[PDB]
Design a protein. Structure first.
Lengths: 57, 1083, 113, 229
C-alpha cells in the first residue's frame, strides 16, 4: 500500500505497466486534490504501460 | 545587460540578507568593548625601565614577554623601555559597518597607539621599536590580566597571544569567549593591536628598498611591518571617507570578502607557505584607490556612481588585466589621483604616495599570479551571458581539498633539526644577510624552496604553491613565542607539501631544454649547469642546435615531474628530505597497461597505440575505395571507441578477447533511387553489398581475413549483418551500411504503427539513431575536443574501468559515460581544467556526487578553450528539459538528461536506465566523496573506493571462465597471429556479457542484473573471474493476482493470487550458466 | 567546418545533352539554373558542415561531392563536368600542435662533449 | 502450497522439481495450462501454456507428453508449438508494418490427444495436491559453451548467399506485380479511371498518401463609412 511519492515510484519501477499501481497513484493524487497532476500521471501511465495490456489500457 | 543585471542583483540582495549579521550581538560586543575602554583607562602606566628591570618584573610575573626573534640583549640595550596610556581606535569590517554573520567566527581589531614622547627618532633601527612594542604589550597584557581578575569575568573569557595575520614581527592579543558580557554566542573575537602614530618615522627612510637593520640589502618586511603599524589609522579614515563618498561600498566589500573566502584567501601573511595576504582590508583599500583613479592616464576608471555589481566588475577586471608585480604597479594618495606606472618592482606594488607604503608586501609572486588567474576566470564566467554563474562563483568553496583545488601534490618530510643542525642539514646557508632578507627561517626556506622548484620546472607548470603542514599562529600567554618540536625540526610545521597547477601539453616532454652553447660560457648557461650538476650535458639535435639540456626517463607509473622534483630537492635543498605521492603512483598503477613493447616506460599521454590502429585502418580504407562495385562508395566513417580515445585498455594486435576488439565503421554508399522499399529486403540488400565486398577482398587482398557476424542489437531488426574484417596488423573492424532509406523507413513505421505501439517503436528508432547517425558527430567532436584536452582520454579510461569494477557498465552506455567524464573539462568552473589523472577523476566524482539529476539537467559546450551554444539554443534545451520533467516528474522513464549541439533532445544516451541503477550510481559517488572527506586521501582509501561493495545484492552468482583471458586481452601482469578457424576465435571469445544480456531480456519485467564487462582488468590475477549481481523488483518480490501475462516465474500462495519463485529462478540462472556457474549466494 | 575553418567552395557544372538530342544546343532556363544552384549550395553546405577539414580533404580527393551533386540534380536537368572548382581558406582557429601531430600520425641527442 | 492444485479461473498448476545444484543446498517449477478457444483453423486443438521453463521447445514438449502418456496410459500426439518468444524479439513485425507474452501455445493432432493430455494433467495436478514426489523433473537442453559459441557462430556464406538470392527473387516478383497492378489503367465498375502519377509503385502507398475584397459593394463601403464615423 504505497503512501509516499517515493513508494509510488518504487512500485512503478517494479512494474511500469502496473495498472493497479497507476490507479492507486491516481486515487492518492485525487485524494490529495491534484487533478492536473493526476491527469499528467495518467498520461505517463499511458506512455509507459505495455501495448500488450489492452485491458489495462 | 538588463536581464543579467536584474537576476544578478536579486541574487546579490538575496545572499546578503541570507548572510546578514545580528544587531543583538552587535550591541553585546559594543557594550563589551565599552567595558574594555573603561578597563584600559583603569590600567596604570609603566615608567622607563631597563632590560634587567623588565626581566625581573615579568620573571616574578607569570606572564612572559613575547620577544621577537632575535631577542634583545643587555649588551646592546643601551636604551630602555616605557609604557604610557595609548591612543585607542577601532578597526575592522565592523569599523567599516560591513560585518557579516560568519559561521566560523570573526574578530574586530582595536588599535593601541604608543606615545610620541615615549618614542625617539632612533627607535626604528635593529628591533628597538619592536622590543618597545613587545614589552609594551607584555605590560598591557599583565595589567589586563589583573583587571580581569578584578572584574571576575575570567570564568568564560579566553585570552591568548597571537600574530597579526600570522606575523611573528607583530604579536597581538587575541580574546575569545566561552559558554553579562558572555559574547561567546556572538561568535566574535577581539584583537588588541599595538601600533605607532602617523609620521613617527620617516617614510622614505622606511621604504622597502631601504635597510634599517645594520650589520646592504633592503629590509622590506621589517619596513612594512613597522610602517603599517605606524599608519594603520590613516587608511581607516581614508576608507571611511570613500565609503561616505560612495553608496554601495559595504555591498562591494561583502561581495569581495565572500568571494575571497570561497577561494580560500585572506589577509594572512602569504610569505611563509600560506595562501593569503590579500583580504578585506586591502580589498577596500584597492576599491578606494580605483575610485580615486587607476588608469595609466590616471583617469577615474572607477566612478563613484556604480552599483555593487558594477563595482565588482571594475575591481575584478582591473585585477585580471593590470599587472602589479612584474611590469607594472599602481600609485595613489590617501590625502593625488591613482596613476598606473608600467614599472613592476618584482612584487605586487600598490604604493600610497601620501604615506609612502606599498600595501601588498604580504604577497608572494606565485600568490599574485594565481589570484590574477582567478580574476580572469571570474571575468569570463561573469561575462558569460548564456549560463548563470552566480552559484558557481559564490556558493562553492574550492579550498576544501588540495587535491581538488590543485593538480599535483608532493609530501616531503624534512628532519632538519635545529638552528645549528641546519648548517650540516641544509645544503644552503642562513647567515646574517639571509636573516636580514628573511627574518624568519620559515620564510627563508619557503622562498628558497619555491625558487628552486620554480626554476626546476618552469614550463612544466602553470602555477605553484607550497604549504608547510604544521603551521600555527597562536600560543599561550606564558610563552615568548610558538614552540614545536615534532617533524625532525624545532619550528612551526611538521613537513611540507608542494602543490602544482601543471601545464598538460608541456608536462610530459622528455627533455628539459636549457640554453644554447658558445665557447664562452655565459651567465645563464653557467648557472644552469651549476644547478643541474651531474645531470647537465651538452647535446645536439637534427636542426643542429647545441644547447645544454637534461634528459629523463618516461614511466607508466609516475610523472617526469615526480623525477625532476625528487632530484631537485634531494640535491639543491637537503640530503635528508623524503619526497612522495603514493596516491598518484597508485592511480597510474591502477590505470590498465597494454602488452606492448616498452609499455613500462610508456607515458600516459602516449596515444601511439591509437595511432597504429588508425594507420592500419587507413590502409584498409584506401583498399575499399579503390575497390570497384555496382555503386560507388560515398564514404567510410569510423565510429570506434578506439577512434575516439575511450577504450579501457589500449588496442593491441591480435588481442581479440577484448570486447572493443572489433571497432565499428559506418560504410555509406552513394544515393541510388533503386533501393528496396521494404525494411528487411533493404537489410538484405545491405548484406548483398557486404557479401560482394567480402568476395572481392578475399580474391584480391588475400592477406586480410573476413567473416559475417549476424547483429540484432537494434530491436525488431532480425537481419543486421556486420562484415568482420581482420587486418594483418592484428586489428579488427566491423562494417555496416547506412541509408537515407533506413531513416525514412523507420519514420514510416512510426507513422503506420498503432498509438499504443508508438512508444516502443519510438524507442527502437531512438536506438537506431544513437547507433547510426549521431554517433558519428559525437565521435568527431569527441576526438577534436580530446586533442585540445589531453588528459580527458586517461581520465575517462580510468572512470570507465571504475564503473566496470562496480558493475554499472552493462547498463550505462559508453557515450553517456564519456559525456559525464568530459563534463569537468568543458565546464571547468569554478576550478581549473584538470591537469592530472587524480585531479580529473576526483573532479568527475565530485560532480557526479553533487549532481541532482532530478532537478538539474546537463548541457555541454563541447568547444575548445579561448560554435558555442547560443542563448536561443540554450533556452530551447531548457524548455525541452522542463517539458520532459513535467511529463515525468519523478524520472521513472528517464533519470539523466545530457544535451549538446550534437544532441538537442537530451535523450539519446540516457534512455533505458533503471532508476535503481541511477540511484546506486549517485550513492556510490556520495559514499566515495564522504570517505575521502573523513578518512583522508590515502592508498587505502583508493583501494576502498575501487573495490566493489557486493552489498544490497539479492543474489550473487560467482562464475569463472575455463581459460585465462588476461594475456590474450593483452594487459601486462601473448598471442601473435589469428587462429586459422574463426570458429576458434569465437571459442576464445568471452560469453558472460551476452549471457547476462539475454537473461536481462528474459527477466527485465521482474529482475535487474549486472555483470563485469571487462574481465581482463577485473577478473583477478588470471583474468577469469566474473560475478552477476541480481536484484528483484518490489511487487513481483511481493504478490499479484495471477493474470494471463504474468511475466514472471511464480509460486501461487492461493488459488487466484501468486507469489514469485525465487529458487526456480536461481535454478534457471544456474542452468543457463551451467558450465560457468561455480558459487551462488542468496540474500 | 566543425573544425572552425571558415571555408569557401566554388562548384561548376555544364548542361550536357541527352542521348537522342537533335537540337544543336543544350541550354537550361533561368529557372532550372536557379534550382540547380540552390541544390548545389545546400549539398555543399550540408557536406562541409557535417565534415571536418581532414575529413573534408578525404572527401574531396576521390571526387565524391560532385558525384553527389550529379546524383541529386539528375532529375532537373542532365549535367556534365560537375566539379568542385576551388576551395579557399578564410579563417583558421587557434593553433593545435597536437592535432597536427595526430593528423600526420620525443627525440634525444647524441652527447656532444 | 500443497493443497493449491488448480486455479479458480480454470488454470491448473503443473509443478517441476529441479536438480540439487552444487551451489544450492528440490524445486517445483509451477506451470499452467488451459484449452484454447480460437476461431483460427491453425490455432485449434491448442493448449495455452503459462510460465514455461526457458527454451521450452518441441523436444521438451515431446518428453513431457511421453511422461504423461507412459504414466497415465493415455495417448496424445503433439504436432507443433506456438508463440515461443521467451526473450521478446518478435512482438512487432516491422516488415508488414512498412510494406500473449511469457506464454505459449501447443497444438496437437486431434481432440482425442488434447483431452487425453488434459486428463493426464488433471491427474498431475492431483499428484501435486496429494503426493508431490510422483511428479516429473524438468530437464533443460543445457545452455552451455557449445550452444553459445554456436550463438557466436560466424555465419555460413553459402547459407547467406542462398537466403539473399531467394529473398530478392521473390521480392522482385512481388514488386513488379505491384508495378503492373498500379499502372495498368484501373477502371471502376462504373465509368471511373484512377489517376496515378508517374513513378508510383503501390496502391497501398496511395491509400497511405490519403482573395476577398473589403471595399467593393454597397454594404461594404457604407459600413466602412459608418464605423469610421
Amino acid at each position: 500500500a504505497p503512501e509516499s511519492v517515493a513508494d509510488f515510484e518504487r512500485l512503478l519501477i517494479g512494474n511500469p505497466n502496473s495498472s493497479v499501481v497507476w490507479m492507486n497513484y491516481m486515487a492518492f493524487q485525487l485524494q490529495l486534490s491534484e487533478i492536473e497532476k493526476a491527469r499528467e500521471l495518467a498520461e505517463r501511465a499511458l506512455k509507459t504501460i505495455n501495448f500488450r495490456e489492452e485491458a489495462e489500457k | 545587460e538588463l536581464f543579467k543585471s536584474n537576476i544578478f542583483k536579486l541574487q546579490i540582495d538575496e545572499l546578503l540578507e541570507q548572510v546578514k549579521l545580528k544587531q543583538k550581538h552587535v550591541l553585546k560586543v559594543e557594550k563589551f568593548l565599552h567595558k574594555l575602554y573603561d578597563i584600559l583607562q583603569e590600567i596604570p602606566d609603566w615608567e622607563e625601565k631597563s632590560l634587567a628591570e623588565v626581566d625581573s618584573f615579568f620573571k616574578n610575573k607569570i606572564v612572559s614577554v613575547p620577544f621577537v626573534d632575535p631577542k634583545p640583549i643587555p649588551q646592546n640595550t643601551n636604551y630602555k623601555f616605557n609604557y604610557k596610556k595609548p591612543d585607542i581606535s577601532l578597526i575592522g569590517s565592523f569599523a567599516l559597518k560591513a560585518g557579516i554573520y560568519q559561521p566560523n567566527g570573526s574578530s574586530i581589531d582595536t588599535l593601541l597607539t604608543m606615545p610620541k614622547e615615549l618614542f625617539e627618532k632612533k627607535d626604528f633601527l635593529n628591533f628597538r621599536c619592536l622590543h618597545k612594542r613587545s614589552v609594551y604589550l607584555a605590560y598591557l597584557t599583565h595589567h589586563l590580566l589583573i583587571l580581569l581578575k578584578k572584574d571576575k569575568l575570567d570564568s568564560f573569557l579566553q585570552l591568548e597571544y597571537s600574530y597579526f595575520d600570522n606575523d611573528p614581527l607583530l604579536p597581538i592579543l587575541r580574546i575569545s569567549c566561552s559558554k553579562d558580557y558572555n559574547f561567546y554566542k556572538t561568535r566574535f573575537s577581539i584583537n588588541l593591536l599595538i601600533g605607532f602614530p602617523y609620521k613617527v618615522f620617516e617614510p622614505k627612510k622606511l621604504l622597502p628598498n631601504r635597510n634599517c637593520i645594520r650589520i646592504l640589502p633592503a629590509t622590506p618586511l621589517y619596513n612594512f611591518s613597522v610602517l603599517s603599524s605606524s599608519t594603520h589609522e590613516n587608511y581607516l579614515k581614508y576608507l571611511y571617507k570613500t565609503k561616505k563618498q560612495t553608496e554601495s561600498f559595504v555591498e562591494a566589500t561583502v561581495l569581495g570578502r565572500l568571494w575571497l573566502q570561497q577561494r580560500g584567501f585572506s589577509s594572512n601573511m602569504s610569505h611563509s607557505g600560506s595562501l593569503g595576504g590579500f583580504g578585506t582590508f586591502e580589498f577596500t583599500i584597492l576599491m578606494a584607490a580605483l575610485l580615486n583613479g587607476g588608469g595609466i592616464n590616471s583617469n577615474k576608471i572607477l566612478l563613484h556612481g556604480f552599483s555593487s555589481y558594477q563595482l565588482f566588475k571594475g575591481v575584478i577586471k582591473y585585477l585580471a588585466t593590470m599587472d602589479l608585480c612584474h611590469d607594472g604597479h599602481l600609485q595613489f594618495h590617501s590625502n593625488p589621483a591613482s596613476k598606473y606606472i608600467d614599472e613592476g618592482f618584482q612584487t605586487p606594488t600598490l604604493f600610497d604616495k601620501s604615506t609612502k607604503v606599498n600595501i601588498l608586501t604580504k604577497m608572494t609572486v606565485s600568490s599574485y599570479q594565481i589570484l590574477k588567474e582567478y580574476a580572469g576566470e571570474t571575468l569570463r564566467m561573469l561575462n558569460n551571458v548564456v549560463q548563470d554563474q552566480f552559484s558557481n562563483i559564490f556558493l562553492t568553496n574550492i579550498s576544501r581539498f588540495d587535491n581538488l583545488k590543485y593538480d599535483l601534490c608532493y609530501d616531503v618530510q624534512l628532519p632538519l633539526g635545529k638552528y645549528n643542525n641546519l648548517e650540516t642539514s641544509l645544503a644552503a646557508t642562513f647567515g646574517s644577510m639571509e636573516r636580514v632578507k628573511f627574518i624568519t627561517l620559515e620564510n627563508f626556506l619557503a622562498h628558497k624552496i619555491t625558487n628552486v622548484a620554480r626554476y626546476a620546472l618552469g614550463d612544466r607548470i602553470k602555477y605553484i604553491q607550497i604549504e608547510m603542514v604544521g603551521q600555527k599562529s597562536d600560543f599561550p600567554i606564558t610563552k615568548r613565542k610558538v614552540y614545536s618540536n615534532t617533524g625532525g625540526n624545532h619550528f612551526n610545521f611538521d613537513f611540507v607539501r608542494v602543490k602544482l597547477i601543471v601545464n598538460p601539453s608541456e608536462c610530459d616532454k622528455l627533455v628539459t631544454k636549457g640554453p644554447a652553447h658558445s665557447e664562452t660560457m655565459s651567465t645563464e648557461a653557467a648557472v644552469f649547469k651549476n644547478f643541474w650538476g651531474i645531470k647537465s650535458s651538452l647535446r645536439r639535435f637534427k636542426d643542429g642546435s647545441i644547447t645544454h639540456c637534461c634528459v629523463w626517463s618516461t614511466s607508466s607509473s609516475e610523472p617526469i615531474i615526480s623525477s625532476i622534483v625528487n632530484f631537485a630537492l634531494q640535491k639543491h635543498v637537503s640530503k635528508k628530505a623524503q619526497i612522495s605521492n603514493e596516491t598518484i603512483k597508485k592511480f597510474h598503477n591502477f590505470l590498465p597497461l597494454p602488452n606492448l613493447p616498452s609499455s613500462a616506460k610508456t607515458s600516459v599521454l602516449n596515444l601511439s597505440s591509437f595511432f597504429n590502429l588508425k594507420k592500419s585502418f587507413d590502409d584498409l580504407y584506401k583498399i575499399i575505395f579503390q575497390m570497384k562495385l555496382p555503386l560507388s562508395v560515398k564514404s567510410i566513417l569510423p565510429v570506434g571507441s578506439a577512434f575516439r580515445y575511450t577504450s579501457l585498455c589500449q588496442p593491441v594486435p591480435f588481442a581479440y578477447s577484448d570486447p572493443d576488439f572489433f571497432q565499428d565503421v559506418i560504410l555509406e554508399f552513394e544515393t541510388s533511387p533503386k533501393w528496396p522499399d521494404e525494411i528487411t529486403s533493404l537489410e538484405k540488400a545491405k548484406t548483398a553489398f557486404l557479401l560482394k565486398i567480402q568476395e572481392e577482398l578475399s580474391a584480391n587482398s588475400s592477406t586480410y581475413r573476413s567473416f559475417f557476424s549476424r547483429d540484432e542489437s537494434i530491436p525488431y531488426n532480425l537481419e543486421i549483418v556486420t562484415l568482420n574484417i581482420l587486418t594483418p596488423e592484428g586489428y579488427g573492424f566491423k562494417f555496416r551500411v547506412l541509408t537515407e532509406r533506413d531513416e525514412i523507413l523507420y519514420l514510416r513505421a512510426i507513422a503506420n504503427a498503432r498509438n499504443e505501439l508508438k512508444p516502443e517503436l519510438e524507442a527502437t528508432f531512438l536506438k537506431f539513431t544513437a547507433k547510426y547517425l549521431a554517433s558519428v558527430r559525437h565521435t568527431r567532436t569527441l576526438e577534436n575536443i580530446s586533442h585540445s584536452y589531453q588528459f580527458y582520454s586517461p581520465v575517462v579510461r580510468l572512470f570507465k574501468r571504475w564503473l566496470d569494477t562496480h558493475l554499472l557498465l552493462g547498463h550505462i552506455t559508453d557515450e553517456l559515460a564519456e559525456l559525464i567524464a568530459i563534463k569537468p573539462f568543458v565546464d571547468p568552473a569554478p576550478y581549473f581544467i584538470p591537469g592530472s589523472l587524480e585531479n580529473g577523476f576526483l573532479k568527475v566524482l565530485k560532480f557526479i556526487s553533487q549532481w541532482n539529476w532530478k532537478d538539474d539537467p546537463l548541457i555541454l559546450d563541447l568547444v575548445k578553450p579561448e560554435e558555442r551554444l547560443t542563448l536561443a539554443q540554450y533556452k530551447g534545451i531548457q524548455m525541452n528539459f522542463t517539458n520532459l520533467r513535467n511529463s515525468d516528474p519523478n524520472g521513472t522513464h528517464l533519470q539523466f538528461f545530457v544535451a549538446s549541439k550534437n544532441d538537442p533532445s537530451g535523450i539519446l544516451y540516457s534512455s533505458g536506465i533503471p532508476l535503481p541503477i541511477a540511484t546506486r550510481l549517485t550513492a556510490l559517488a556520495k559514499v566515495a566523496v564522504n570517505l575521502l572527506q573523513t578518512h583522508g586521501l590515502n592508498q587505502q582509501t583508493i583501494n576502498l573506493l575501487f573495490t566493489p561493495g557486493l552489498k544490497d545484492y539479492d543474489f550473487v552468482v560467482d562464475l569463472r571462465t575455463p581459460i585465462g583471458l588476461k594475456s590474450s586481452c593483452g594487459i601486462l601482469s601473448a598471442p601473435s597471429n589469428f587462429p586459422e578457424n574463426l570458429n576458434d576465435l569465437s571459442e576464445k571469445m568471452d560469453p558472460t556479457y551476452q549471457l547476462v544480456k539475454y537473461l536481462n531480456l528474459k527477466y527485465k519485467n521482474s529482475l535487474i542484473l549486472s555483470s563485469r564487462k571487462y574481465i581482463g582488468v577485473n577478473g583477478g590475477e588470471k583474468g577469469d573471474k566474473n560475478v552477476i549481481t541480481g536484484l528483484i523488483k518490489p511487487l513481483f518480490k511481493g504478490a499479484h493476482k495471477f493474470r494471463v501475462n504474468l511475466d514472471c516465474n511464480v509460486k501461487p500462495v492461493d488459488d487466484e493470487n501468486v507469489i514469485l519463485n525465487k529458487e526456480a529462478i536461481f535454478h534457471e540462472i544456474a542452468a543457463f550458466g551451467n558450465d560457468m556457474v561455480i558459487n551462488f549466494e542468496t540474500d | 567546418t566543425s573544425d572552425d575553418y571558415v571555408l569557401r567552395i566554388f562548384a561548376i557544372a555544364f548542361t550536357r545533352k541527352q542521348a537522342n538530342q537533335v537540337k544543336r544546343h543544350s541550354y537550361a532556363q533561368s529557372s532550372h539554373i536557379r534550382a540547380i544552384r540552390k541544390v548545389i549550395s545546400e549539398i555543399l553546405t550540408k557536406e562541409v558542415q557535417g565534415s571536418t577539414l581532414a575529413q573534408l580533404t578525404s572527401k574531396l580527393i576521390p571526387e565524391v561531392i560532385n558525384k553527389e551533386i550529379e546524383n541529386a540534380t539528375k532529375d532537373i536537368f542532365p549535367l556534365q563536368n560537375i566539379h568542385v572548382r576551388k576551395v579557399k581558406l578564410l579563417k583558421q582557429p587557434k593553433f593545435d600542435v597536437g592535432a597536427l601531430m595526430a593528423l600526420h600520425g620525443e627525440e634525444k641527442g647524441k652527447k656532444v662533449t | 502450497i500443497e493443497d493449491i492444485s488448480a486455479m479458480k479461473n480454470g488454470f491448473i498448476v503443473v509443478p517441476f522439481k529441479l536438480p540439487d545444484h552444487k551451489a544450492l543446498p528440490a524445486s517445483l517449477h509451477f506451470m499452467f495450462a488451459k484449452r484454447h478457444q480460437s476461431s483460427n483453423s491453425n490455432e485449434s486443438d491448442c493448449l495455452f501454456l503459462v510460465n514455461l521453463p526457458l527454451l521450452s521447445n518441441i523436444e521438451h514438449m515431446k518428453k513431457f507428453v511421453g511422461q504423461l502418456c507412459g504414466k497415465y496410459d493415455t495417448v496424445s500426439h503433439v504436432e507443433e508449438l506456438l508463440y515461443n518468444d521467451e526473450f521478446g524479439l518478435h512482438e512487432v513485425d516491422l516488415s508488414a508494418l512498412t510494406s500473449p507474452r511469457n506464454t505459449a501455445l501447443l497444438k496437437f493432432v486431434d481432440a482425442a490427444s488434447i483431452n487425453n493430455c488434459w486428463n493426464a494433467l488433471k491427474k498431475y495436478s492431483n499428484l501435486h495436491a496429494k503426493h508431490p514426489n510422483e511428479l516429473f523433473e524438468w530437464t533443460y537442453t543445457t545452455p552451455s559453451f557449445t550452444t553459445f559459441v554456436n550463438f557466436y557462430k560466424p555465419l555460413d556464406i553459402d547459407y547467406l548467399k542462398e537466403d539473399i538470392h531467394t529473398h530478392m527473387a521473390i521480392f522482385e516478383q512481388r514488386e513488379a506485380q505491384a508495378q503492373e497492378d498500379v499502372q495498368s489503367s484501373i477502371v471502376d465498375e462504373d465509368g471511373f479511371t484512377l489517376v496515378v502519377g508517374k513513378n508510383t509503385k503501390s496502391l497501398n502507398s496511395i491509400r497511405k498518401k490519403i482573395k476577398a475584397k473589403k471595399d467593393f459593394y454597397r454594404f461594404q463601403v457604407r459600413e466602412r463609412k459608418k464605423q469610421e464615423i
